[PDB]
Every structure is written in structure tokens, then in C-alpha cells.
Amino acid sequence: SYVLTQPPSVSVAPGETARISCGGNNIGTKVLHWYQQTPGQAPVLVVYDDSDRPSGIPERFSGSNSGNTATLTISRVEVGDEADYYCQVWDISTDQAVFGGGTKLTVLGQPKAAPSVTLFPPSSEELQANKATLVCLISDFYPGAVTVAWKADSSPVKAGVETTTPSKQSNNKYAASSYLSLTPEQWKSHRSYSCQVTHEGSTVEKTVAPT
């Protein structure tokens, strides 16, 4: 099948011009189309027929195609343009649509933001049901990675910990959550439990205790 090659990632400063390449053998002989996809939503057509824009798409988005490489060009890049961009062709030799693997656009210069951490103890209701879950909710951080450590009193605990990947909040900051599953006996036998969130070298710790 025909192959379209895109770089996995492109970074650009705000207000500058982002260029996203899409390589293919003699791709210049085919018409190429492009999609923008924001985390959690359906893709949106931004360019079709190499260089044309659907109504409603800003003139900042332009396309070109010649030789063995096509390019989506985004002028005066805004933080709001962060998304995954896909190129696409129709392969006449095999009657199928082919997509590139996608390029994630990052806009540089976004300020570091420390996480907000909220930690909840097991509910009375859950304890009544002979179970216990500590819930550590982590939000508003940038860049989008944290590591989470839990402690029972001062002892690190890894068993029973489940942590999500980071997710984009659309304010372009990130969120994640971590859960610690305990027995009611474990909950009762310690003075406190702590969720410790490390972000860019700085640790934010929150603690809860049986009340």
C-alpha cells in the first residue's frame, strides 16, 4: 500500500510559522488533504486538494505539495493550534484511503505551572462496604508529566496504586489521577496516608487521616 510519512512531533514558537511535512513517493502527483484533531474530539478537515481551505478555516492554514513531500503550513501559530495533524491521500492503485501517522504540534513558551492536588479519604459508605480507596486528583500542571508516590505514615507503598496517564485540559494544562486501594484495617492502623506529586523537580504532598 502507499505510505505517507509524517514526523511524530513538531515544535514552534508562538506567532511563528509551523511547517508539518508529509512524505510519499511522487506524492506531488496526488492530491493531499489534511485534518486537525484536538484531544477527545473528531478530526476536522483543514485543507483539501493540496491547498484549498473549507469555509470557516482560518487563512493562517495553507498547504503545498510537490515532488516527494507535502507541507501543511500554519502561520502566526497560536497555543490554540496545539493538536494532532494528519495528512491523507486516496491510493488509486488499491482503492483505499491512507493516513499519515500524525504529527503532534507543540507551541513553545507556555509557562511552567505546578499541580493542584486534592486528596480524599475513603468514604464512610465505602468503609461500610468493607473497602477503602484514597483518591488523589491532580490538575492544572504544565508541562504534562508528573510522578506520584504514596506513603502509609512514612513508608512508601506501591501495592494497590493505580495512576492514569496525563490528559490535556484544553486550557492546555494537564490532569491526572492516582488511586490507592486499601483494606479498612490498613486505613485504620496508620496515622495518615500521603499522596506525593512530583512535577519538574518539585514535590506537592497532601495527607489525609482517619477522622
Binding site: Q37, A42, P43, Y86, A97, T133, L137
Partner: protein, 217 residues
Amino acid sequence: EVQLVESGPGLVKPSDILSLTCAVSGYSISSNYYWGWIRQPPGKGLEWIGSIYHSGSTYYKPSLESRLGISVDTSKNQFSLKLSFVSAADTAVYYCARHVRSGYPDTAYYFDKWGQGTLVTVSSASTKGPSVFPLAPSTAALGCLVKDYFPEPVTVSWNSGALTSGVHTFPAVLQSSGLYSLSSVVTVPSSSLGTQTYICNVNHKPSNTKVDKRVEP
């Protein structure tokens, strides 16, 4: 003005048939265009599946052709997908999309109108509704823990949708057990705790679970 909406089961057992339907609004399939399906496995790229014209003529992705059927019902303005012998590799968000034929000479199609997508999980595990527990406030953060459900997704609102500002519903964790849990938290004025009632409304369509849990201080 043209809209597309996918529907069908969110859970299919391995080796069974995955079926979806796309309802079109704002344009008659009988008039024009190809109509087709694109999917996206969690965390991966887009993959085209196939398309159909009102005459019944189809294009199928060659790698899937042996397992694929696409049908069209112009009388109901809908078209459908059937993918047989599924495995976990077929867990994905499935989109329907209008396929526009380019005005250029060589055959070319692009996708100008898309549905919102629907998740289908392929798994042998049974549907399970969540247990919902209140996360009591000590402004104040309060919430609901939506524990141990399968499959995705779950929706959460607050006060039947009357409360929206300050709401943060977090993406679910997938546990080693194969079940999911998520939490939804809302930040509210500390001042309002004695006077305002707070209820999270949890909906898990796959198990027909509807829970309203009041969260008390």
C-alpha cells in the same frame, strides 16, 4: 447543516461481529457522496475502514475486506458497518464521515463532515455498573468516586446539569482487574455548604445504571 451520528453497542465479545449504524441529517444519502467509516484505537492514529455509495457500491480497506460489510439504507437515510471476527485490536473510537469526491481528474476522496465518534471495546468481560461513593468536602472541593465499572464510558453531571462551573471530571483509570474507576470533583464556595444541596448524577449506559448520590459535608 450536515450531521452524522454513530450508534450501536459499546461492547463486543472477541470473535463476534461488531455492528454500528450512522444516521445522517441535513443531506440525503440518495443524492450524492460516498459515506464511510474511520476508526482510532486508543492513543493511536486514524485508520480508514471503508465506504459506500447509495447504489450499494463499496470500497473496503484491503486488509479488512474479508471481515467487512458496509450497507446503506437510503429509505432511512442511514448506513452501517459490520466487522466480523473482532479482537482487542478492534477496540477503537469509530467515526462515520462523508466522503467527498475531489473535482480533480484522478479519483480522490476526502472527509469533510464527521460524526462525534463512538467507542467500541472488544472484551470477554461482562458489563458491570459502578458503585458511586460521595467524596465529602472538608472554597471547598467535593465529589463523587465512580468505582469499578465496565466498559467505558460514564457520564457525570451535577445537580441535573444546573451546576457546571468548577466541575472537573477526570479521565478514568483502567485497573489491573480490567475494571475502570473515575472521579468528578467540583469546587464550590465554602460559604454555601449548609444551604446548597449537591448531587452528582452518574450514568453508565452499558449497564443501564443511573445513580444520583448526594454529597453531604
